[PDB]
Design a protein around this ligand. Structure first.
Ligand SMILES: [Mg+2]
Ligand SMILES: [Mg+2]
Ligand SMILES: [Mg+2]
Ligand SMILES: [Mg+2]
Ligand SMILES: [Mg+2]
Ligand SMILES: [Mg+2]
Ligand SMILES: [Mg+2]
Ligand SMILES: [Mg+2]
Ligand SMILES: [Mg+2]
Ligand SMILES: [Mg+2]
Ligand SMILES: [Mg+2]
Ligand SMILES: [Mg+2]
Ligand SMILES: [Mg+2]
Ligand SMILES: [Mg+2]
Ligand SMILES: [Mg+2]
Ligand SMILES: [Mg+2]
Ligand SMILES: [Mg+2]
Ligand SMILES: [Mg+2]
Ligand SMILES: [Mg+2]
Ligand SMILES: [Mg+2]
Ligand SMILES: [Mg+2]
Ligand SMILES: [Mg+2]
Ligand SMILES: [Mg+2]
Ligand SMILES: [Mg+2]
Ligand SMILES: [Mg+2]
Ligand SMILES: [Mg+2]
Ligand SMILES: [Mg+2]
Ligand SMILES: [Mg+2]
Ligand SMILES: [Mg+2]
Ligand SMILES: [Mg+2]
Ligand SMILES: [Mg+2]
Lengths: 68, 229, 197, 125, 54, 145
RNA sequence: UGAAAUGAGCGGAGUAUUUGUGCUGCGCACGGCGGCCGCACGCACUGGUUUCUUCUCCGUGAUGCUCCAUGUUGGCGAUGGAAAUGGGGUGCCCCCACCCGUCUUGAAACACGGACCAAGGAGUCAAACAGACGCGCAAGGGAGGAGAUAUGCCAGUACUUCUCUCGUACUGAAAGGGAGAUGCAAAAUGCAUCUGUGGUGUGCACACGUCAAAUCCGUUUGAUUUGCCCAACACC
RNA sequence: UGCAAGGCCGGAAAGAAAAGAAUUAGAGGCACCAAGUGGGCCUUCUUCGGUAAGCGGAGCAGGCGAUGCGGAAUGAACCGC
RNA sequence: UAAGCCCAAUUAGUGAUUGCCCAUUAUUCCUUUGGUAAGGGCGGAAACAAAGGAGAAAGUGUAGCCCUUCCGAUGUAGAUGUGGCCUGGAGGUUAGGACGAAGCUUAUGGCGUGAGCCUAAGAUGGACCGGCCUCUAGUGCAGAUCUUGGUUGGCGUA
């Protein structure tokens, strides 16, 4: 026998029971994979240099603190 | 006999008692001065407006009154069969039960919200007597998430911790004149819970203009609330 | 009636008592509930909550990790001050990958025999919580630590391994069975390794 | 001995909660059972039907478990059990078990008279 | 529903369970301590019989 | 070694001194002044304890556990008998000398013992008067040997 | 029924304060005209006057952690086959009230099963896997089979080696290969040290300061600066 | 020494003025394990097929189903709650 | 001369503001129960014989350690909790019985919201058995055109 085909009667109520959650903020999950490659490669070189600078900065802080 | 730790407890308690009595006497004097100041301000404002109206009439002009700044809103319908948009607004006004009542500012953002839920509310412009009666008779504060009746001025001072709100007359003045601490005072109070109006209503399903009850009824709201408080 | 629709969704599930059957755990809970109620330190409150927690949420810690974090704190501490006491609400286990360690004072619910021997041989002391309550009632000059929870096999198994961007392990006993279709491009399709979120 | 005075007993409800339609079938006991029928008028709370138990009928905690005499019952089986009630004799009254024989009951009653301990099911005196 | 579980291979589709129509195919170890005692007793008796040989 | 706090955790739910009848929890511990099943009143468990007991005649006896020989059951409890007419405050002071937190309950128990002794004499006399008017038919005597 | 009376009400002492009305001073404000004229009596000077109107000021912590315990006048009750108050039983009056279980959007139904009672009557046992919770040990955990002697009451308990199994390392179809940090440097297996988070952002507690509110003046409750950041998340 | 990108150092910050110039019975985020259900029906506004139907098919919302109570004499869905 | 229809009032050109009746709703008072619950007390202050009294546990859950305060409470399918109730057997512990155990009968009351527990009487019976902490299972019936036994209106009828 025939039956109901389709309806959207109760769906809005179901979606709002646990609410419609907002988006993740922009500073999270901001991966750069798939972007324009030439700019991606150049940015990798700068980040490698910055890590070496960070290590050097900590050593100087330790030596200065020990000297009081 | 009492020994060791039982002595300094007695001495510290003795100093606590006298300090409590001194603080209570100081607060009573402060509340007396502020109440006297407010009453003189209210009388002076009324006499000023009376003279201004007389001057305009004697020369054929008109005097335009200032637009109302405060409204009092009460819910007059149950909780059944409410659309989602109306349901959301009534929750943001804290009107979750029939015959709950609140004070709101009568500005443009609030006016458009009251328009969307008109069939559920009756509102108007309160008077000094109405504000005073609600605070003294139906006034409750939110203390640690509990609904606590106001019974002395020390309770008010501890709740707000502001030098401008120390007594019950300070709360009345802020609400009635829409002072700079209007939001702080009203947000700190539990929503008012009132009784049904003695003598009945006309028709809750029609606007006041049509002979019903809901909508804006101006200063006639005070007669309505006088039978509910 | 009052319109309180969806008000039960703001309730939170918190344990108020322990499920343990250990009388010594019960004694420690009694002592630190008293301390948390009657003092003004956050250390006692945190210790009380962690004592209430369950075994799976009290992951063990490594002696090498303790040593590393203690050194990183000590490099920026004046030489006229004493090193803090490491405090773990859980178990401390030995580490064969690190042989040389400094003298440290550690308090924990339980020590393995190897860890106790290593600490004593290095020249430190192993303390219990009842001793700690007398040495530092308010937790002054301490270092609260937790063990690692990520890296467990159950955590590695959580999720569906057949959706794009997922790298969870499937539940299977035969390692060589669930290859081919759905995991290689040559067999119909391959699950995508990456997906933007 | 006189029991300690308490506030008046209220007893929110005195009638028992009996099973639906137990009067029409001899085999059905009057012990309460929760009706789970889909069309049951008792479950659906019709106006003229029987009521159902819930938490609102609970008794005042100040006067709970107190017998009309003003004491609370504590079962006893021999003479030595009386010494538990010596200090708190204004709060608890002893109840002798059904299976205690007549020979032993004579010793329990005689001892309780001297200690001034009330027996719920004593004899005369 | 089924959810996320291991795909089962329990291998119990033959008539192994003894029932009203099947003899079954099972082996239990309820005689293990008795057999252990019997073996030790037999070893002691054999040693006594073949004394003094190892 | 093994403290009172540890032992109370072990025996709180199950002990031969715990009488849980009906819904009431009582204690038949001989060294309990109240009959309540609490850690404070469990005299068999505490390091120090004191209890008020009646004596022959109309006297009141105080049994004290000093906590110096808890590993020798034969020498654990020592009795100090006081003759009749002793003030109830004097008895409480003897108890308070070993455990100050039992002073109030021991005072009330001392008065209760005195009232029982006087009532027993009055009841026994009345019963004997009734028994003298009854012929009876049998009476047994224990052999003196 | 005063076993804490917090009182404009109880107690004590004064019998005068100060709220309003009326009248009125200066300056400002307000209205009209084009600075002068008006001010119904607005703000400041807590402006003056006392003609009317009104009471004013002090006082009792818990050395009580909690529960129970206290007036007046009559009727009934003087130990009985007594009185009283609760239960229990049967009838009656006024009001209320469709037959249970079930499938179903919808049952009371002209939808099915339903004469009465007793006894019986339906999510169990085993194996593989996973999650939550309890317990032991921990880079290790644990057998199983079997033996040995207490042991010849005892199908239990006590003891034991190698081994076996899961794990400490993964990856490729396979032949195969196989994971530290820092510094100098740039070697087709580079060299040197070994008390050490590979880096960045956000991140308990603790340590050093500062600011608020409250305070029985001992200290508390919140914020924030800096350091290290544990667990954890994101990007490399 | 211009633009792009990643960092370091320093300053300022009604922490968001005034003009009707928001409000909240306003603690955010993240996981693990699992049930029932997958025949619906009615009403308000908008509608498609049909002469029409207590007929068939859809959009938004509220209900009955799963719910009594007080009203419309009586009624699953109407009015009040 | 409505007890009908359309308007309009509240005791009526006299004096200014609510005629009356009926809810599982609103306000308020008493009691219960559960919290994402909020606070206080818990070193026995001193003193006190019969011929003012008792209690006072550092605590999820009880006959709740005690006291104060605020808020919520209906519900099919379904999920979870309970120092929640009941039945046959096992390891412990503590009792009862020929001056009468189990079983059976009830206008026998008492207790608990309830599952149920306890006492009384037998003008019943004649030999075993109760409470508490753990362990264990062939562990709770109103209906399946359910199984077996007995009974029964139709009926002194065809
Ligand atoms: Mg369908
Ligand atoms: Mg009406
Ligand atoms: Mg409507
Ligand atoms: Mg790992
Ligand atoms: Mg009852
Ligand atoms: Mg239904
Ligand atoms: Mg499904
Ligand atoms: Mg004392
Ligand atoms: Mg006076
Ligand atoms: Mg019916
Ligand atoms: Mg049908
Ligand atoms: Mg039906
Ligand atoms: Mg029909
Ligand atoms: Mg059918
Ligand atoms: Mg191995
Ligand atoms: Mg070898
Ligand atoms: Mg691995
Ligand atoms: Mg390989
Ligand atoms: Mg390959
Ligand atoms: Mg603004
Ligand atoms: Mg179906
Ligand atoms: Mg159809
Ligand atoms: Mg259905
Ligand atoms: Mg309805
Ligand atoms: Mg009609
Ligand atoms: Mg309540
Ligand atoms: Mg419910
Ligand atoms: Mg059986
Ligand atoms: Mg009968
Ligand atoms: Mg069965
Ligand atoms: Mg049956």
């Amino acid at each position: 026998a025939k039956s109901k085909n389709h309806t959207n009667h109760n769906q809005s109520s179901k979606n709002h029971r646990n609410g419609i959650k907002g988006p993740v903020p922009l500073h999270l999950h901001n991966s750069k994979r798939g972007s324009w490659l030439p700019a991606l490669v150049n940015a990798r070189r700068v980040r490698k240099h910055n890590q070496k600078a960070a290590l050097k900065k900590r050593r100087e802080r330790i030596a200065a603190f020990a000297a009081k | 006999k009492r020994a060791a730790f039982k002595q300094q407890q007695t001495e510290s308690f003795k100093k606590a008692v006298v300090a409590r009595k001194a603080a209570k006497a100081a607060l009573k004097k402060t509340a007396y001065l502020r109440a006297r100041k407010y009453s003189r301000e209210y009388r002076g404002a009324e006499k000023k407006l009376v003279t201004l109206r007389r001057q305009a009439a004697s020369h054929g002009n008109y005097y335009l009154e200032a637009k109302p700044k405060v409204a009092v809103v009460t819910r007059i319908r149950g909780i059944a069969k409410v659309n989602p948009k109306q349901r959301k607004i009534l929750q943001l006004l804290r009107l979750r039960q029939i015959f709950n009542t609140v004070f709101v500012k009568m500005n443009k953002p609030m006016e458009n919200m009251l328009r969307a839920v008109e069939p559920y509310i009756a509102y108007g412009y309160p008077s000094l007597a109405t504000v005073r009666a609600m605070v003294y008779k139906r006034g409750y504060l939110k203390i640690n998430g509990q609904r606590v009746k106001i019974t002395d001025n020390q309770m008010i001072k501890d709740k707000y911790n502001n030098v401008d709100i120390v007594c019950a007359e300070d709360m009345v003045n802020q609400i009635y004149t829409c002072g700079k601490h209007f939001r702080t005072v009203t947000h700190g109070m539990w929503p008012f819970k009132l009784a049904p109006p003695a003598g009945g209503m006309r028709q809750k399903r029609r606007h006041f203009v049509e002979g019903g009850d809901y909508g804006n009824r101006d200063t006639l709201i005070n007669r309505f609330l006088a039978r509910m408080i | 009636g009052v319109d309180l629709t969806g008000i039960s969704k703001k309730s939170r599930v918190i344990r108020h008592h322990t499920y343990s059957t250990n009388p010594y755990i019960k004694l420690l809970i009694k002592l630190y509930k008293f301390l948390a109620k009657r003092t003004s330190s956050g250390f006692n409150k945190v210790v009380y909550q962690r004592l209430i927690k369950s075994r799976s949420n009290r992951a063990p810690i490594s002696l090498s990790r303790i040593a590393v974090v203690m050194k990183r704190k000590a490099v920026f501490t004046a030489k006229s001050k004493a090193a803090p006491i490491a405090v773990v609400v859980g178990d401390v286990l030995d580490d064969v990958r690190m042989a040389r360690i400094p003298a440290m004072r550690v308090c924990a619910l339980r020590f393995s025999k190897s860890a106790r021997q290593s600490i004593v041989a290095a020249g430190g002391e192993c303390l219990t919580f009842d001793q700690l309550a007398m040495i530092a009632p308010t937790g002054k000059n301490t270092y609260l630590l937790r063990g690692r929870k990520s890296g467990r096999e159950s955590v590695r198994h959580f999720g569906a391994s057949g959706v794009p961007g997922s790298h969870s392990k499937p539940y299977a006993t035969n390692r060589g069975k669930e290859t081919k279709r759905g995991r290689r491009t040559g067999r119909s399709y391959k699950r995508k390794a990456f997906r933007h979120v | 001995v006189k029991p300690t005075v308490s506030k008046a007993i209220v007893k929110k409800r005195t009638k028992r909660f009996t099973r639906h339609r137990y009067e029409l079938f001899p085999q059905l006991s009057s012990s309460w059972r929760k009706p789970r029928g889909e069309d049951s008028p008792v479950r659906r709370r019709y106006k003229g039907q029987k009521a159902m138990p819930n938490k609102g009928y609970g008794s005042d905690r100040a006067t709970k478990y107190i017998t009309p005499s003003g004491f609370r019952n504590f079962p006893i089986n021999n003479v030595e059990d009386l010494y538990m009630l010596v200090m708190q004799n204004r709060k608890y009254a002893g109840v002798i078990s059904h299976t205690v024989g007549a020979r032993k009951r004579k010793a329990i009653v005689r001892k309780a008279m001297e200690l001034d301990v009330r027996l719920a099911n004593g004899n005369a005196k | 529903p089924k959810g996320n579980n291991a795909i089962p291979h329990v291998h119990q589709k033959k008539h192994w369970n003894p029932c009203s129509s099947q003899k079954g195919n099972v082996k239990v170890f309820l005689n293990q301590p008795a057999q252990k005692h019997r073996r030790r007793r037999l070893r002691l008796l054999k040693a006594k019989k073949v004394f003094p040989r190892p | 070694s093994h403290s009172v706090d540890l032992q109370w955790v072990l025996v709180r739910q199950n002990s031969r001194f715990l009488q849980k009848r009906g819904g009431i929890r009582m204690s038949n511990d001989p060294f309990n002044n109240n009959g309540n099943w609490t850690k404070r009143h469990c005299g068999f468990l505490n390091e120090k304890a004191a209890v008020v007991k009646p004596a022959k005649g109309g006297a009141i006896c105080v049994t004290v556990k000093d906590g110096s020989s808890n590993n020798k059951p034969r020498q654990t409890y020592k009795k100090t008998v006081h003759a009749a007419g002793v003030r109830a405050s004097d008895v409480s002071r003897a108890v308070a000398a070993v455990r100050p937190d039992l002073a109030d309950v021991s005072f009330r128990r001392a008065r209760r013992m005195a009232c029982i002794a006087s009532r027993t004499a009055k009841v026994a006399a009345a019963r004997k008067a009734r028994s003298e008017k009854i012929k009876f038919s049998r009476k047994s005597a224990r052999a003196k040997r």
